[PDB]
Amino acid sequence: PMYVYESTVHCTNILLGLNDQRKKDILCDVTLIVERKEFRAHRAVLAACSEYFWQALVGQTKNDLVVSLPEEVTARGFGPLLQFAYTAKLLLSRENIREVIRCAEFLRMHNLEDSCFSFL
Amino acid sequence: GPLGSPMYVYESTVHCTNILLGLNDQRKKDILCDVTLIVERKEFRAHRAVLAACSEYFWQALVGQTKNDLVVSLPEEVTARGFGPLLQFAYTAKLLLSRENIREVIRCAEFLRMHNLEDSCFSFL
């Protein structure tokens, strides 16, 4: 007979830990340059999220990997999307909602249109 | 200092699960992994960040490690029979055990100080 445990909190706790690492720049492995701003990340997390980042990061080897995103990607739209990849949460205002949606479109994140948003 | 009320919300209740599923897929394919674990002469590919996030032992072992190629030999306390199901728990949130391996696995979990097991019905003795 088998003993089974399925942790309901585990997946979310790991990502929380990954995000804490990102924020403190611990154990990251890529720097993304987006509109001249540097963003540290775990390539594996980004690739898990988007087929865009998979294609962009799978080949890579260079000791200190640095990847510049093209000009369609702005810092204002990207920051919240990087945060989302880790937290599963977006919380935007009128200043950035347009840019975030447009960025998500460029990065081919399928289900992030106007209609996915609710109000607090 | 945002402009406007940050009131437009989206929260995905599947996202995290989907990320760990992607990570586990990477592990099984050995694509986008970044560390080899040697446990009782057997190799396991993994992601150091993920290990450090699941385990206090791995956090302390790995936090300063910025090398690209990284191989980590675990001590004799860690056996393959004991570690197998824990690495699998780390990447799936699921732990399946039987009478045959429960002790060896629980003991290994204590050594590695694995997280997110306190809500399970396993005693740690």
Short mmCIF file of C-alpha atoms in Angstrom, two decimals:
data_model
loop_
_atom_site.label_atom_id
_atom_site.label_comp_id
_atom_site.label_asym_id
_atom_site.label_seq_id
_atom_site.Cartn_x
_atom_site.Cartn_y
_atom_site.Cartn_z
CA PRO A 1 0.00 0.00 0.00
CA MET A 2 1.20 3.52 -0.92
CA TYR A 3 1.39 6.67 1.23
CA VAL A 4 0.64 9.81 -0.72
CA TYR A 5 1.20 13.45 0.06
CA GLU A 6 0.34 16.17 -2.41
CA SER A 7 1.47 19.53 -1.10
CA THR A 8 -1.05 22.21 -2.08
CA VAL A 9 1.37 24.98 -1.03
CA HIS A 10 4.68 23.70 -2.52
CA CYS A 11 4.60 25.11 -6.09
CA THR A 12 3.77 28.57 -4.82
CA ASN A 13 6.38 28.40 -2.02
CA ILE A 14 9.16 27.45 -4.48
CA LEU A 15 8.38 30.38 -6.79
CA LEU A 16 8.25 32.64 -3.76
CA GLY A 17 11.78 31.41 -2.95
CA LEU A 18 12.89 31.92 -6.55
CA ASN A 19 11.56 35.48 -6.49
CA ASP A 20 13.31 36.21 -3.17
CA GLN A 21 16.57 35.02 -4.86
CA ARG A 22 15.89 37.26 -7.88
CA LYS A 23 15.25 40.28 -5.71
CA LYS A 24 18.50 39.72 -3.78
CA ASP A 25 20.38 38.67 -7.00
CA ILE A 26 21.22 35.26 -5.51
CA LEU A 27 21.66 32.23 -7.75
CA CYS A 28 20.43 33.93 -10.91
CA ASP A 29 22.01 33.01 -14.26
CA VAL A 30 20.98 35.65 -16.81
CA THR A 31 20.90 39.44 -17.13
CA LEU A 32 18.21 40.79 -19.44
CA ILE A 33 18.84 44.26 -20.88
CA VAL A 34 15.50 45.90 -21.55
CA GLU A 35 15.55 49.47 -22.77
CA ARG A 36 18.97 49.89 -21.07
CA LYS A 37 17.78 48.62 -17.66
CA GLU A 38 19.33 45.42 -16.24
CA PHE A 39 17.09 42.60 -15.00
CA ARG A 40 18.47 39.46 -13.29
CA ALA A 41 16.50 36.23 -13.74
CA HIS A 42 16.62 32.44 -13.77
CA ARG A 43 16.58 31.41 -17.43
CA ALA A 44 14.77 28.19 -16.58
CA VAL A 45 11.85 30.05 -14.99
CA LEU A 46 11.49 32.45 -17.96
CA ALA A 47 11.63 29.50 -20.41
CA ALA A 48 9.03 27.62 -18.37
CA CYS A 49 6.77 30.68 -18.82
CA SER A 50 7.11 31.57 -22.53
CA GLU A 51 8.01 29.83 -25.78
CA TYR A 52 9.64 33.19 -26.61
CA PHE A 53 12.13 32.90 -23.74
CA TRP A 54 12.64 29.20 -24.43
CA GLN A 55 13.76 29.92 -28.04
CA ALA A 56 15.81 32.86 -26.73
CA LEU A 57 17.65 31.11 -23.87
CA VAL A 58 18.03 27.35 -24.60
CA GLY A 59 21.16 27.49 -26.74
CA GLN A 60 23.12 29.78 -24.44
CA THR A 61 26.43 28.97 -22.71
CA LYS A 62 28.61 32.08 -22.13
CA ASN A 63 29.83 32.28 -18.52
CA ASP A 64 27.95 35.51 -17.72
CA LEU A 65 24.91 35.39 -20.01
CA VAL A 66 23.56 38.81 -21.03
CA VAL A 67 20.55 39.00 -23.36
CA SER A 68 19.21 42.27 -24.81
CA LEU A 69 15.54 42.34 -25.75
CA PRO A 70 14.56 44.27 -28.88
CA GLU A 71 13.00 47.76 -28.75
CA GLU A 72 9.41 46.44 -28.93
CA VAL A 73 10.02 45.48 -25.28
CA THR A 74 10.01 48.47 -22.88
CA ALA A 75 11.17 48.47 -19.23
CA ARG A 76 7.74 49.76 -18.02
CA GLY A 77 5.85 46.83 -19.62
CA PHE A 78 8.49 44.17 -18.96
CA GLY A 79 9.06 44.66 -15.19
CA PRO A 80 5.55 43.63 -14.20
CA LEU A 81 5.69 40.64 -16.60
CA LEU A 82 9.01 39.43 -15.07
CA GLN A 83 7.42 39.80 -11.59
CA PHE A 84 4.37 37.85 -12.87
CA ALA A 85 6.50 34.95 -14.16
CA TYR A 86 7.61 34.45 -10.56
CA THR A 87 4.50 35.43 -8.52
CA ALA A 88 1.55 34.51 -10.82
CA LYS A 89 0.29 38.04 -9.98
CA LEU A 90 -0.15 41.27 -11.97
CA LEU A 91 -1.39 44.48 -10.37
CA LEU A 92 -1.26 47.47 -12.71
CA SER A 93 -2.47 51.04 -12.97
CA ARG A 94 -3.45 53.28 -15.87
CA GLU A 95 0.24 54.29 -16.33
CA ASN A 96 1.45 50.80 -17.29
CA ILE A 97 -1.50 48.52 -18.22
CA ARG A 98 -1.29 49.28 -21.95
CA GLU A 99 2.48 48.73 -22.12
CA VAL A 100 2.23 45.49 -20.12
CA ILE A 101 -0.43 44.03 -22.43
CA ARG A 102 1.55 45.07 -25.54
CA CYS A 103 4.77 43.59 -24.11
CA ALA A 104 2.92 40.34 -23.27
CA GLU A 105 1.71 40.18 -26.89
CA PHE A 106 5.29 40.64 -28.20
CA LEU A 107 6.53 37.97 -25.77
CA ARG A 108 3.66 35.71 -26.92
CA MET A 109 2.04 35.23 -23.51
CA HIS A 110 -1.26 33.93 -24.73
CA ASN A 111 -3.81 34.80 -22.06
CA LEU A 112 -2.91 38.33 -20.98
CA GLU A 113 -5.41 40.64 -22.74
CA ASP A 114 -7.66 43.46 -21.35
CA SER A 115 -10.33 41.00 -20.33
CA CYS A 116 -8.15 38.98 -17.93
CA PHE A 117 -8.11 41.97 -15.54
CA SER A 118 -10.53 42.54 -12.66
CA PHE A 119 -10.72 45.32 -10.04
CA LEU A 120 -9.52 45.11 -6.44
CA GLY B 1 5.38 56.11 -6.56
CA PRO B 2 2.95 54.71 -9.14
CA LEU B 3 0.63 56.99 -11.11
CA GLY B 4 -3.04 56.10 -10.73
CA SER B 5 -4.66 53.48 -8.56
CA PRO B 6 -2.85 50.16 -8.89
CA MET B 7 -6.19 48.38 -8.97
CA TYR B 8 -6.13 46.29 -12.15
CA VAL B 9 -5.53 42.74 -11.03
CA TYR B 10 -4.80 39.39 -12.56
CA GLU B 11 -3.94 36.33 -10.53
CA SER B 12 -3.46 32.93 -12.08
CA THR B 13 -4.21 29.94 -9.88
CA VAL B 14 -2.47 27.56 -12.30
CA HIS B 15 0.67 29.61 -13.13
CA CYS B 16 2.99 28.28 -10.37
CA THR B 17 1.95 24.67 -10.87
CA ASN B 18 2.62 25.24 -14.59
CA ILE B 19 6.08 26.66 -13.90
CA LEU B 20 7.08 23.68 -11.74
CA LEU B 21 5.69 21.36 -14.46
CA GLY B 22 7.92 23.18 -16.99
CA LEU B 23 10.94 22.91 -14.62
CA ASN B 24 10.38 19.19 -14.15
CA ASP B 25 10.10 18.73 -17.91
CA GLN B 26 13.45 20.56 -18.29
CA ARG B 27 14.94 18.27 -15.60
CA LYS B 28 13.82 15.03 -17.30
CA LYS B 29 15.10 16.23 -20.69
CA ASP B 30 18.25 17.73 -19.08
CA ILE B 31 17.66 20.98 -20.98
CA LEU B 32 18.21 24.33 -19.26
CA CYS B 33 19.55 22.58 -16.10
CA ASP B 34 22.69 23.95 -14.41
CA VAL B 35 24.00 21.46 -11.78
CA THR B 36 24.77 17.67 -11.61
CA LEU B 37 24.20 15.99 -8.24
CA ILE B 38 26.26 12.87 -7.48
CA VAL B 39 24.42 10.75 -4.97
CA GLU B 40 25.87 7.33 -4.20
CA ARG B 41 27.64 7.27 -7.59
CA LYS B 42 24.41 8.13 -9.52
CA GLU B 43 23.89 11.40 -11.46
CA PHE B 44 20.89 13.75 -11.19
CA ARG B 45 20.60 16.90 -13.28
CA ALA B 46 18.76 19.78 -11.61
CA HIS B 47 18.54 23.54 -11.19
CA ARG B 48 20.56 24.95 -8.28
CA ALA B 49 18.04 27.75 -7.64
CA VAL B 50 15.25 25.20 -7.34
CA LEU B 51 17.30 23.04 -4.93
CA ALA B 52 18.17 26.03 -2.77
CA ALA B 53 14.48 26.92 -2.70
CA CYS B 54 13.30 23.41 -1.65
CA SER B 55 16.08 22.62 0.86
CA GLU B 56 18.04 24.38 3.62
CA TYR B 57 21.02 22.07 3.06
CA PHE B 58 21.07 22.91 -0.64
CA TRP B 59 20.60 26.61 0.06
CA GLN B 60 23.78 26.66 2.21
CA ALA B 61 25.71 24.36 -0.12
CA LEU B 62 24.86 26.36 -3.23
CA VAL B 63 24.35 30.06 -2.47
CA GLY B 64 27.87 31.28 -3.35
CA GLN B 65 28.12 29.06 -6.47
CA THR B 66 28.29 31.20 -9.64
CA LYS B 67 30.21 28.67 -11.80
CA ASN B 68 28.54 27.52 -15.02
CA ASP B 69 29.56 23.84 -14.93
CA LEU B 70 28.78 22.65 -11.39
CA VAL B 71 28.93 19.11 -10.02
CA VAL B 72 28.00 18.43 -6.36
CA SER B 73 28.90 15.22 -4.54
CA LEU B 74 26.60 14.57 -1.62
CA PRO B 75 28.02 12.73 1.44
CA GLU B 76 27.36 9.13 2.47
CA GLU B 77 24.27 10.16 4.50
CA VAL B 78 22.43 10.72 1.22
CA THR B 79 21.53 7.48 -0.59
CA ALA B 80 19.93 7.18 -4.01
CA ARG B 81 16.90 5.31 -2.60
CA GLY B 82 16.38 8.06 -0.04
CA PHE B 83 16.99 11.05 -2.32
CA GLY B 84 15.14 9.90 -5.46
CA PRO B 85 11.61 10.56 -4.03
CA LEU B 86 12.70 13.87 -2.47
CA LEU B 87 14.11 15.27 -5.71
CA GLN B 88 10.92 14.16 -7.33
CA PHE B 89 8.85 15.90 -4.57
CA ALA B 90 10.91 19.08 -5.06
CA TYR B 91 9.86 19.25 -8.75
CA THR B 92 6.25 17.90 -8.57
CA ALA B 93 4.96 18.73 -5.07
CA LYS B 94 4.13 14.97 -4.80
CA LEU B 95 5.73 12.34 -2.52
CA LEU B 96 4.81 8.71 -2.91
CA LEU B 97 6.33 6.31 -0.34
CA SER B 98 5.81 2.74 0.89
CA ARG B 99 6.80 0.68 3.92
CA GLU B 100 9.93 -0.37 1.96
CA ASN B 101 11.50 3.08 1.65
CA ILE B 102 9.68 5.48 4.04
CA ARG B 103 12.33 5.49 6.78
CA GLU B 104 15.30 5.98 4.42
CA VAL B 105 13.39 8.77 2.65
CA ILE B 106 12.29 10.52 5.90
CA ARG B 107 15.84 10.34 7.27
CA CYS B 108 17.19 11.87 4.00
CA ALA B 109 14.53 14.62 4.21
CA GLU B 110 15.75 15.46 7.74
CA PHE B 111 19.38 15.66 6.59
CA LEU B 112 18.50 17.88 3.59
CA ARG B 113 15.97 19.84 5.68
CA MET B 114 13.42 19.68 2.88
CA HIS B 115 10.62 22.25 2.96
CA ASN B 116 6.85 21.97 2.57
CA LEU B 117 6.44 18.56 4.26
CA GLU B 118 5.10 19.75 7.61
CA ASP B 119 1.46 19.54 6.30
CA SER B 120 1.96 15.84 5.31
CA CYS B 121 0.86 12.91 7.45
CA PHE B 122 4.46 11.75 7.91
CA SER B 123 6.14 11.91 11.31
CA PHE B 124 9.82 12.97 11.26
CA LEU B 125 11.56 10.97 14.00
#
